[PDB]
Design a protein around this ligand. Structure first.
Ligand SMILES: Nc1ncnc2c1ncn2[C@@H]1O[C@H](COP(=O)(O)OP(=O)(O)O)[C@@H](O)[C@H]1O
Ligand SMILES: Nc1ncnc2c1ncn2[C@@H]1O[C@H](COP(=O)(O)OP(=O)(O)O)[C@@H](O)[C@H]1O
Ligand SMILES: Nc1ncnc2c1ncn2[C@@H]1O[C@H](COP(=O)(O)OP(=O)(O)O)[C@@H](O)[C@H]1O
Ligand SMILES: [Ca+2]
Ligand SMILES: [Ca+2]
Ligand SMILES: [Ca+2]
Lengths: 375, 375, 375
C-alpha cells in the first residue's frame, strides 16, 4: 500500500474476526463472526435497516434476530453466511479491495483438509486476492513472546489445543485437539443455571450468556475448597441487572463454569483438564526434547483471560509431570491476541515471500494449490 | 404393606391433581391443579365453602374465583397454593393424613435446587410427614414402561424433559430440560384463538382454554397437509361450547396450538420441539448407545396424550435417523396416567423407599440431603 | 482332567485373552482383556447388570463404560483390573478351578523382570495353581508350522518383535522390540481421521476404531503409487454406517494407517518398518547362521492378518538384505493363533515336565522361583 507492498493480517475463529492492515500492533476492524436474520416477523413499513444484520450491527440489535452462528469450533455450520461476514471486513471497515492486497489468516489448527481449499477458492477464484497465507495459530505467539521452545496451550473460543513446540516445529503424533474451550465455557453456563432458576435458552439471550460470563465470572483456584466458600455471600454473589430488566445473581456459576476446563467430570466426559492434556502432549515426543518446554509453558487466547488462571496451572502441572525443574507458565500481559501479533511480524517481513500462495499459482495448480504449497 | 410402608401418590404440577394411594390403579382425585381464590365477592351473609379451593370447586364453581395456575414452567409460584393442596387432597379427597401415610410427589423434572428442599419442607417441617419423595416425573413413566433402555420424553403441563436411560442412566451431558410444555399451550391457545374469534385474558378463561386444549385441539396429520386442507372449515371446524352458554368453533387452530410441540414456528421465541429435543438427547449421549434407544422411544406425560404423536414420532424422528436402525415408539395408551401408574408401582417398593427421604434424613443431616438422596 | 493330567493353555496379550483346555486346536474361551466401569452416571433403580462389566460383557454394552484398558504393550497400566479379568476365564467360561490344573500362558517377549514373579504370585500365592509356564511367544509358532530355522516376526496387538530363530534359540543381542503394532494401528487411525473430519476421541468410540479398522482397512502394496489411486472412488471409499448412526466413509485411511508398519515417517519416529528391523535382527548374529532364516520368514499374529501383507515383504525384504537366495515369507492360513497352537503341543506333551514351576517349588524358592527356573 502506498510506497511499499504491505497486506492485511487477519485472525478469525469461532468467536471474533479481528482484522487489521499489516505491521500493526493489534486489531483495527473487529466483529463477531455471525450473521443475523429477522426471527421477530410481523410486517414492516419502518424497518431496522437490514436484511442480514452482520457482526457488530447484529450483536447490537439482538432482539429481532436469529443469529446464525457459523464457525462453531473451526467447522462452519453452513458456509453461506460467511461470504457476507467477510463482505464486512474489507470494504466496509478497511475500505480496501481484497482484489489488491495480500491476506494473512490463521489455520484454526486441524480445520479439515477441504476447508483449506474451500477458503482459498472464496478468495482466489471468487474474489481474486493477490496472495494469501493462513498461519497455524499457537506457534505465532511464541516468537512475539520471544520464545523458541515451550509448550503452548492456545485456545480462544472454538477448540482447545496443547502444542509442544521447540527450536523446530511440532507434528501430529504429539499435539492434541479438544472441544471444551472459551465458547463452550460461554454456552455451558446455561446447563448449570437451572439450579438457581435461570436458563437463557434461546438466541438473543444466548449472546447475553457470552456477555455476562466474560465480564465477571472468575476461575476457581481450587474448586473443592471454594465450594464451602459458596456460603460466603460477598465473594460470590453480585448483581447483573440486565439492561433490559432481569437480575442474574451469578453466584457459584461464576467459577463453576470456568472449572470445567480442568474438570470435565462436570459436563460428562473422560477428558482431563488442560493441565493433564498438557502432560499428554509433552510426553509423546522424543526423549531429549522436554527440558525447556517445561521451562516456558505459553498460555494464550480468549480462554486464558479469566481472573485466576496461570497460578492454577503452577500448582496443577507439577503433580503428574517430570519433577526436576523450573516449571513456568508465560502468559503475556495481553495474551489473547497471540495469534494476531505473531502473525503481524510474518506479514511485515518481506522474507515471508519464500512461502505463500500467489494469485497465479492457484490457477497453475487448481484448487489443490493449498496442499501443494502447505498441508 | 409387604415391601413398603404404603405412601400416597401425587402427580400435580401445572395441569391436573392426580392423587391416590400406592396400590390404586387410576388416580382418585383427577381435577385441575388450579388454586381458587375468590374475586367476585361483593358482600356475603354466607359464602360458598373455602379460603383456597383446589380443582374440586374451582372447576365446578368457576367464575367467582380466580383460577390460579400454582405452578408455571414446573416451578411453584407461592406458598398459599401447594402448601395447602398437599395436605388438603390427602385429608379431604382421599381421607388419610400425610402425617400418617408417607408422600410421593412429582418433581417437574429439574426445578431449582432448594425446590427439592422446599417441596420436602411442605411435608417435613409444615405437617411432619414421616417420609417422602419429590420424584422426577419421567422416571415414573420409565418404570411404568418396565425396562433399562429407553429414551423417555415426558411432557407434563409444567415442563418437558428428555431422559436417555440405557443399561445405566444418563450422565449430565446427555439429558435435556425443555421450557415447552402444556402450560405453553395454555398461553398459546389464548394467544391464537383471537384470529378465529375468541380473545382470552384472565384466569377464568385460562381454565376454559385447558378444557378446549385437552380434547378438541390436537397435533395435525402433518402441519402442511392439514393447513393446505384448511380452507375447508366444514371439514376442519367443529364446536366446543363454554359450559355456560357460548359457542367456540375451532378448526385450523385445532392443530396450530399443540403442533407447537413439533414445530416452534408458531410461538414468538424459539422454544425447541419434541423433535429437536429428541435429537439433542439421543445425539448428546455416548457414540455406541443409540441403537436400542431408537428402538425404545418412550413418549409420556400429560401433553403427549393426544393423537398425532406416537404415529408422528414414527414419522418425523426419521429425518435424523441414519441408514441402519429405525425409530420404534413406546407410547402408553393412557400416558398422562403412566406417570401415576409408575408412581403407584414405585411407591409400593422398598428400593424406592430407601432411595427416597425419611423424616430424619433432614434435620440432623442438613436439608439439601434431599437434593443428595435423588438429585 | 478325567483319566489324564491335562491342563489349560492360554495366550493373553494386550488385546485378547484366548483361553482353552489342553491338546485343543485353537481357542474356546476368548475375551478382550479389559475392565469397564460406569462413566455414564445419573442414578439407578433398574441397572444394566454390573459393577465391573468385564471383557465380552464389557465390549458388548460399551456406552455406559469407561473401559479401563490394562496390558497396553505388555506393561499393564495398573494391575487391579487384571485379577477380575482372569476371574472370568476359569470359573465363568471354563468352569474349572485354577487351584486344580496346570496353566500355560505366554511371555510377551521382554515383559519386565518383576512381572514374571508378580504374575506367578497372583496364581501360586493368591490362587494356588498347581503348575505353570509362560512360553515366549514367537518361537512356539515355528514348530506348529513345521519349521526349525527362520526369522519370525510375531506381533498381535501390543509389541513388535523380530526374532531370528535357528535349530537353537535366539538371544538378546540380535532380537528386537518395537512399539508400533496391531493396536497402535488401531489407535493411529484417529490421528489421521481429522483430515476428513472425524475423530472418535473418547472411550466407546475408541473401541469402535479397533472394530472399524479390522473389518475393511487393507495394506497398501506400494503406498506411493496407490496415493494417486486415492482419486479412484471405488477401490478406496466404502460405507461404514455405524449401527448407532454415523457414516464413516473410510477412504484412504483404509491403507494409510496400515502403511505405518513399514513407514514410521508418518507418525514421527526414525523406526524403519518391520521389513528393515528384520534385516536388523538377522545381521547381528553369527556369520554362518542366516542361509535358512532367509529360506523361511515366519509372519504371525493379529498384525499379519490384513489383506495384502506377505506379498509386500516379498518385494521389500530383498532390497537391503543378502542377495543370494530363495527368500520366502511363510505366513500360515490362520497365522494369528501362532502362539496358541505352538503352546498347545507343549502343554499336551508330558515331556514338558522337565521344565515347569510346580506348586511347592515356589514356596521352596520364594517369589524369585520364576528367575530360578526360567529368566
Ligand atoms: N475482556 C474479556 N475478558 C475475557 N474474555 C473475553 C474478553 N473479551 C472477550 N472475551 C472472550 O474471548 C472469546 C473470543 O475468542 P476469539 O478471539 O474469538 O478466539 P478465536 O479467534 O481464536 O476463535 C469469547 O469467549 C469472549 O467471551
Ligand atoms: N386426552 C388428553 N390429551 C391431551 N392433553 C390432555 C388430555 N387429558 C388431559 N390433558 C391435559 O394433560 C395435562 C395434565 O398433565 P399433568 O401431568 O397434570 O401436568 P404436570 O406434569 O405439570 O403434573 C393438562 O393440561 C390436561 O388438561
Ligand atoms: N478377523 C480379523 N482380521 C484382522 N485383525 C483382526 C481380526 N480379529 C481381530 N483382529 C485384531 O487382532 C488384534 C488382537 O491381537 P491379540 O490376539 O490380542 O494379540 P496378542 O494376544 O498377542 O496381544 C487386534 O488388533 C484386532 O483388531
Ligand atoms: Ca483466532
Ligand atoms: Ca404430571
Ligand atoms: Ca498374545
Amino acid at each position: 500500500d502506498e510506497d511499499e507492498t504491505t497486506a492485511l493480517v487477519c485472525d478469525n475463529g469461532s468467536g471474533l474476526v479481528k482484522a487489521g492492515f499489516a505491521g500493526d500492533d493489534a486489531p483495527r476492524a473487529v466483529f463477531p463472526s455471525i450473521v443475523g436474520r429477522p426471527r421477530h416477523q410481523g410486517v414492516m413499513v419502518g424497518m431496522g435497516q437490514k436484511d442480514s444484520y452482520v457482526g457488530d450491527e447484529a450483536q447490537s440489535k439482538r432482539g429481532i434476530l436469529t443469529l446464525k452462528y457459523p464457525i462453531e469450533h473451526g467447522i462452519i455450520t453452513n458456509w453461506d453466511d460467511m461470504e457476507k461476514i467477510w463482505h464486512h471486513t474489507f470494504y466496509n471497515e478497511l475500505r480496501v479491495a481484497p482484489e489488491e492486497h495480500p491476506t494473512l489468516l490463521t489455520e484454526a489448527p486441524l480445520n479439515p483438509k477441504a476447508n483449506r481449499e474451500k477458503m482459498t477458492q472464496i478468495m482466489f477464484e471468487t474474489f481474486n486476492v493477490p496472495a494469501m497465507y493462513v498461519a497455524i495459530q499457537a506457534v505465532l505467539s511464541l516468537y512475539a513472546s520471544g520464545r523458541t521452545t515451550g509448550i503452548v496451550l492456545d485456545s480462544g473460543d472454538g477448540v482447545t489445543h496443547n502444542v509442544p513446540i521447540y527450536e523446530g516445529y511440532a507434528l501430529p503424533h504429539a499435539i492434541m485437539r479438544l472441544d471444551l474451550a472459551g465458547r463452550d465455557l460461554t454456552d455451558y453456563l446455561m446447563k448449570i443455571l437451572t439450579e438457581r432458576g435461570y436458563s437463557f435458552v434461546t438466541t438473543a439471550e444466548r449472546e447475553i450468556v457470552r456477555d455476562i460470563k466474560e465480564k465477571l465470572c472468575y476461575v476457581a483456584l481450587d474448586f473443592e475448597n471454594e465450594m464451602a466458600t459458596a456460603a460466603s455471600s460477598s465473594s460470590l454473589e453480585k448483581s447483573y441487572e440486565l439492561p433490559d430488566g432481569q437480575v442474574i445473581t451469578i453466584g457459584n456459576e461464576r467459577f463453576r463454569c470456568p472449572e470445567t476446563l480442568f474438570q470435565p467430570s462436570f459436563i460428562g466426559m473422560e477428558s482431563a483438564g488442560i493441565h493433564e492434556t498438557t502432560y499428554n502432549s509433552i510426553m509423546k515426543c522424543d526423549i531429549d526434547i522436554r527440558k525447556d518446554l517445561y521451562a516456558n509453558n505459553v498460555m494464550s487466547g480468549g480462554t486464558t483471560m479469566y481472573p485466576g488462571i496461570a497460578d492454577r496451572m503452577q500448582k496443577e502441572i507439577t503433580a503428574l509431570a517430570p519433577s526436576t525443574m523450573k516449571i513456568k507458565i508465560i502468559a503475556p500481559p495481553e495474551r489473547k491476541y497471540s495469534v494476531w501479533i505473531g502473525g503481524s511480524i510474518l506479514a511485515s517481513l518481506s522474507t515471508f515471500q519464500q512461502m505463500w500462495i500467489t494469485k497465479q499459482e492457484y490457477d497453475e495448480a487448481g484448487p489443490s494449490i493449498v496442499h501443494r504449497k502447505c498441508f
